[PDB]
Recover the amino acids of this structure.
């Protein structure tokens, strides 16, 4: 039972915030109904295993998830993989199993402070009800809610650009980089 | 062999293993539907298809190894070798169905029956559902397309892998 | 293999809260006894199918429910309908299968926070005892309880206005707009 | 034809299937009170009403395609062609009653019994239907009572089925 | 082989069909009671009723078609067949209610043995309480056991003649 | 003289019904041969013939043979004097209401009184009445022991019927 | 068959908790054995019909039962009776077919929350051992158990008052009102 | 009459039939069915319209009374009070006690009483009235002595029925 | 005594205890086999082996004390005193078999007949037979005797019931 | 050993054992079929074939050791020894048929009669009949005989009972 | 002893102690499986392995000393002395498993069943299970035995819990 022990050791280190980030990043492969009862890393790993995206021979997806959420110590300890090799593998076309849309959304969410989050909320208190605009909601839930109302899509980015222009320029730089990659 | 062994086996098993045993022995009793495991074992003994080796094999399929270590005075290695040499009773299709039904939880079967309701007409288990499907001539060892497609649709690809592996074996 | 699969795919994306909203919105066609043992969208779809309000050649009610709870991605993906067509269709009189009273109640329920919820519970201690003032009750449960004791009828709205006047004026605006529409 | 074929058919059938088959053959043996399905088959054979086509029709009407394929060596397409060409043994009214009886649940049939206790003075829907036929309340040409009762319990799909049948008679 | 076929037919008949045939042929066997079908054929031969066409009509009402085909190797009053049909349409759970309802009319000990409906009809006909033109008692008894469909058949027979 | 009438009467009555006729005429005179001899004695007549059919409750023979139903003979029965005593018809009525599940209790309980032997042949109530009359244990004007037995067999309606008959005359 | 249809419509609107309340309130006219297999309102209505307490021309008991559980909407919608008429009828002596003691017990049961219920269960450990202290039960079951061992009756209320004095005070107000009515 | 018996017997339950047989055991031969019991009662001359009304009132089926016998509760109650009883008070008390025990209570009662009775004599899944008639056969429950029944009832923590027994004792 | 008491006793017994009464009286009436209770009682009365004490003993052995109080007008103590000073009409082996037969529920008799369905015919005991019928069948094959009880004790132990085995041992040590 | 012994033996037996005894003794009494057991015993004793050995053989074949011990006062071991030594009066075919009839139950005999009603006819076996009656009916048509048992084996295999077929083949191999 | 004491004992236990008692009494009645505690106690009484001392030991091993104080009027010191002298009804392996199950909280059994999910399937783990259920399943698969505890010790070590491993080593060194 070496593989299951390794997965348990990896899932031991993750905290609540990393669990939420993983749940957001794994939306395309797990529907909301399965997402709701997930409360720890073991349940998420079981869900990933059920779709045959994670097993003894195949470990690319777990490595990609760990790389995206910026946890390299786990990669170098419990998986024996370094940063350069992961980047080289990801740069190869067809290997990335997470679209650039989710990656850029998470990167944008990683660079917002509480004051900037409040500015983002105030910029979007018109098209969104106050129910999902409570102080407890972070940027990931706001992005999910906007995706639910088809005001933020893969080809639709007007609202995001307009709101980000009122806060910072670096976010617009990241959006421009994503558009360039497209 | 003797009635003592049959009585002990009936006393040992619970309801779920009893239903699995009935499903496994469904094909060998081609025309008789038994209501109890006692009746099934009596029928097998009368027909002459029950012996020490066959009973050990049947108990091994249900995964009750302590019964082999206690009643039949046999371990798993001996029954494994007997399976390797002597041809077995239950077909591979029945044990594949049992293996698939073991992994489906108490909720996925409801979604599966909701999907499949269009081809037919209430705590149904997967074994009962597959018995109904076999009754309606929709699932057969030659026709496994419906089950594979429906298992793919509910996003259970490990079971689809199992079905594909079984098809490749035969 | 086609229609049932589509219904299952639609129902797989609805979490517990959206299921509760759907159950509340459909009280006029599903009595309390049928409402009680429901825990997933598939059973609700079965109940709607039994009453022949949802089938292959009739999908109006499902589209109306999905548009009312503000879920446009499902409409645009799994049903191929845009916001403009749905808005125009619902604006036509005599076509809305859900009474505007329930829609107004749900829109009010979407505009209350936890502090506002506690203020609402405190304001309703006269006609309703502390038994229905449970901290686990949401606003929809309070609305149902009020509807039970004929204090919140379709023609009787004085108590709702009196309670809402102590929280915000936007709720009074919504109620007045509904009354003007009549 | 041979006694062994009908013996196998009688052995393989299930109790609910036995009851449905016994009810569904009431049109032919109108002046016979059958105590068992085997006796019913014997009576049908002795009256010159049972043949390969007739037995195929009876087994196909209770959704037992595996028995058609295994025993009578007939598939669904062939028996459907025989049904289309040869006149049906049983009228579509009994088929409609059986189809309706397979969809009602325990709570629904209990509510139906409570509603209908006024006209008359656990029991499945088939027994309620035969009791209604006994008092000359519902007949293949008059279905107003059953349609009203089905509409009053908020199950309108069955009312749609009845309306389609009533439109198809003309 | 006129005798061989009729002797072979008697073998296939069972007790219930023999009783039904005796009840149907009550009119033919008025002069002497028939003890058995084998002796019933002798009585009919004495009457001179030995004929294939007349004999084949009985099996049509008895509904034993396979023996009818064997005889074919390929008269009776319609009031009695109505009683036969009503008796055959009554299950074993209703004959008890019938004999209990009409217990006061006839001797209680006369019905001590378990009876088929044909026997009860014979007993009531001996008392002339049932007639081809008088069915009020029969109709009332049928209504009291809550079987209105048989009342329709009774009315059909009454209106036919 | 027509023997066909006698033949038809003999054939129409089944075997069990002959015992009723034999018991009815116990004191009148001392199967079909007895009826023929009674005709020779002169007591038997066409008018008295219908009385036997009325008592035995077999009305089909009235229309078949006498050509007169109960409507014609009901008034004649009151007009004609009683050919058979009411004491016999009362016993016949009592035997009518007794089933085969009760005669065993009677014969078992009264085995002590009469001869205990030759009980293998199952006997009807009429046979027991005849046996009691042989030992002078029962009289037409004395039905006390019969009432006691009827009460002992847990049958009260016939006990009241006996008293009603006794008070009637 | 409009009366049976009306009764069926009334019964379809009652969930499980209201059915339990109705079962508890009708213990006077229905013993335990006839009450155990009851799990739907139709069976209760038929049981009442057997004792001739409910028919076409006699609906007073049904109206009283619906009034006691505060289901006035069913009263106005189907039975065509408003609260004022029922209050006037019940104020008249001799028209109350339900003893006031049972109504008082039910009202006490309604006014207790989860924490209050657990405190109520724990407060009985001073005088009764664990045999009758089944915590899995609810307040109504506790009251029934107390009634069985004649520790709580119409003429015996010391234990009830002592337990009620620990948690709340309005319950003591209800008990005192009942005593004043006595 | 004759039709009233049929109408009564066709509109009763199973446990109700058992209760009726237990009540009628006072008035002998064991009756196999309710129809045979009614036939025996009518033949014995004890049956009467008033007696039948009392029998139906003792089992709380007033709807049957109105539907068949065209009588109300007040009339039959006055008739019962004025006229002598048909069923003894002890039988009515036993039936009333039996109606107030659920499945768990009767299971506990049979488990307790199995100590000095045959395991197969009572077996399992039986009503309280069957246990009462078994005790009657063993001759330890009588209309004058009920001490063992009261003690056994107290053992299962049911004191209200014990008070009922005490009140019945005080009555006579 | 007379015919009335026999009739009352016969008509006041259910079908369950009639089998017990037939089994208990096999030793007395072994020249002939009776078909029913009434014939057996009448045969014993005619043979002179039936009296008030014999009927009291039989009713006490069948555990119907209420009939003793009603018909025979005796209580338990009187019949016990009569039994203590009179020879027994039924042997101790018969009453022991009857007593064992009342402590076996359905789940045990079914197990016993399934276990011992091989020594005798499969269709011999196809109908659901009580323990008394099985004991009679075993006695026919001369496997169980008043002095020979090893097979019965082993069969009882084979179904995991040791209290009855201790009862058998107690009876054996009594003699 | 007068007629009293045979009278006791005749009266002690029950219906099924009487039927089995008549079937077993049908071969010897081929001159006249005895309608009653008394007639069979009388004609057997008249010819002088009845003796201690013959009665012991008859009572041992029907499996009733109680009558053998009580009446004949002979143990089963001595009966077996002197039955092996002396010529047998009952044919092995008859005891084989008796054993096969013993191993069958009501459902199986119903299956056989339903399957074989085509040859027998409705009126011949209309009433429910034991397996021995069907065996006699088959032997009437000479379809089954000690030198011809294939049809019986086929019919036994048709009802899914292989152990009886193996027993038949074992008997065939022995002879 | 009697039925009343058994009923009083059963009416006082809660659900968790009921399940613990059912697991503890597995070895004594391994042939059968009881549905609830009352049936298990009845089976124990029927098998003759139930006495006042045995019931006292069973109550003591589940830590319910109050019942042993009032229901049986016994003292724990006397029970300890009896355990010292008399043989133990339950082996130390069962009490060790019960102790380990007691020491494990709710969030660790999920980790344990996830680690050992390869042998089993999801169907059993869909419902919530305690440590005793997992132990029973492992025993049924013959993966854990009283003389074979390496797998359980390794699994306990893998989840960063050492004190339970020390207890396992203590028991292993005890023999």
């Amino acid at each position: 039972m070496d593989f299951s022990r390794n997965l348990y050791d990896i899932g031991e280190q993750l905290d609540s915030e990393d669990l939420a980030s993983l749940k957001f990043l794994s939306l395309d492969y797990i529907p909301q109904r399965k997402q709701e009862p997930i409360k720890d890393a073991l349940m998420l790993f079981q869900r990933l295993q059920e779709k045959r995206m994670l097993e003894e021979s195949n470990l690319s997806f777990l490595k990609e998830l760990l790389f995206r959420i910026n946890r390299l110590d786990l990669l170098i300890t419990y998986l024996n993989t370094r940063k350069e090799e992961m980047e080289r593998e990801l740069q190869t076309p067809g290997r990335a199993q997470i679209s650039a849309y989710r990656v850029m959304l998470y990167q944008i969410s990683e660079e917002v402070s509480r004051s900037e989050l409040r500015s983002f909320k105030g910029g979007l208190q018109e098209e969104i009800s106050k129910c999902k605009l409570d102080d407890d909601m972070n940027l990931l839930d706001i992005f999910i809610e906007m995706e639910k109302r088809v005001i933020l899509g893969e080809g639709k980015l007007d609202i995001l650009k307009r709101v980000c222009a009122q806060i910072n320029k670096s976010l617009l730089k990241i959006i421009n980089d994503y558009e360039e990659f497209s | 062999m003797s009635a003592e062994v049959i009585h002990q086996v009936e006393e040992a098993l619970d309801t779920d293993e009893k239903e699995m045993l009935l499903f496994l022995c469904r094909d060998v009793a081609i025309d008789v539907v038994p209501p109890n495991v006692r009746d099934l074992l009596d029928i097998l003994r009368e027909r002459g298809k029950l012996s020490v080796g066959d009973l050990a094999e049947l108990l091994y399929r249900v995964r009750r190894f302590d019964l082999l270590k206690r009643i039949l005075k046999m371990d798993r290695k001996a029954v494994e070798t007997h399976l390797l040499r002597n041809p077995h009773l239950v077909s591979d299709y029945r044990v594949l169905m049992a293996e698939i039904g073991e992994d489906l939880d108490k909720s996925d079967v409801s979604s599966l029956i909701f999907l499949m309701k269009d081809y037919m007409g209430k705590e149904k288990s997967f074994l009962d559902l597959v018995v109904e499907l076999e009754k309606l001539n929709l699932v057969a060892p030659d026709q496994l397309d419906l089950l594979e497609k429906c298992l793919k649709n509910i996003h259970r690809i490990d079971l689809k892998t199992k079905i594909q592996k079984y098809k490749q074996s035969v």
About this structure: The radius of gyration of chain B is 17 Å. Chain B has two domains: 3-85, 92-169. The CA atoms of residues 101 and 126 of chain B lie 6 Å apart. Chain B touches chain I at residues 3-4, 7, 38 (CB under 8 Å).
